[PDB]
Amino acid sequence: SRGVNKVILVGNLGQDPEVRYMGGAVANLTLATSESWRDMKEQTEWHRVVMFGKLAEVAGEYLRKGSQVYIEGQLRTRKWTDQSGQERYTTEINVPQIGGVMQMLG
Amino acid sequence: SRGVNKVILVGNLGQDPEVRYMGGAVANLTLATSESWRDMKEQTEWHRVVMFGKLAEVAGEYLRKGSQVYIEGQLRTRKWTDQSGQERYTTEINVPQIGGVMQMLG
């Protein structure tokens, strides 16, 4: 490991977490961070978040469509093909099994 | 204002910073974070970083291709339509001119 790749988020799940398996468990969820402007104009940011193992497993048993959470992980930009067939890029927040934290807040 | 959007990075640039103007000065650069894991794989992450104003113009005079730098900012995913006319999204680490940090290391 050479450099630092850390992202801290406190925000609310926009929708329920989606947990899948392959045989490790994966959980995807989207949280929001807001800020306020006055010319009241808000600005919500959506954060593609993905967790693995127990952390994923816990997210399923307890996280909901409004739950608030603290997340520690690293930026990871992954490539994929769209139906039109061109490799596209989506940047998510990886929450590593060893090194990443998540916590429900309430 | 409402939630916590925070990201911390320590890594080295891949290419000389790109500074332009509008409006106040804007500076784009990309830096690398590397990692190692078993079953030894090296996966370099590349991070689109953008600063404005005082930070930007400083980045120009001092930062070059191999420099190490510390970064504090927030994630920002912006939406845009391309030339062929499909929607695309880009996720950057915005270094707000108010509250964002940058430091050269050595």
Curated annotation (Swiss-Prot), chains A, B:
Keywords associated with the record: DNA damage, DNA recombination, DNA repair, DNA replication, DNA-binding
Q: Enumerate the GO terms in the molecular function aspect.
A: enzyme activator activity; single-stranded DNA binding
Picking any one GO biological process from the record gives:
DNA repair
Provide the Gene Ontology terms for cellular component: nucleoid
Enumerate the spans annotated as SSB domain: 4-102
**What does this chain do?**
Plays an important role in DNA replication, recombination and repair. Binds to ssDNA and to an array of partner proteins to recruit them to their sites of action during DNA metabolism.
Subunit info here reads: Homotetramer.
Designated name of the protein? Single-stranded DNA-binding protein 1
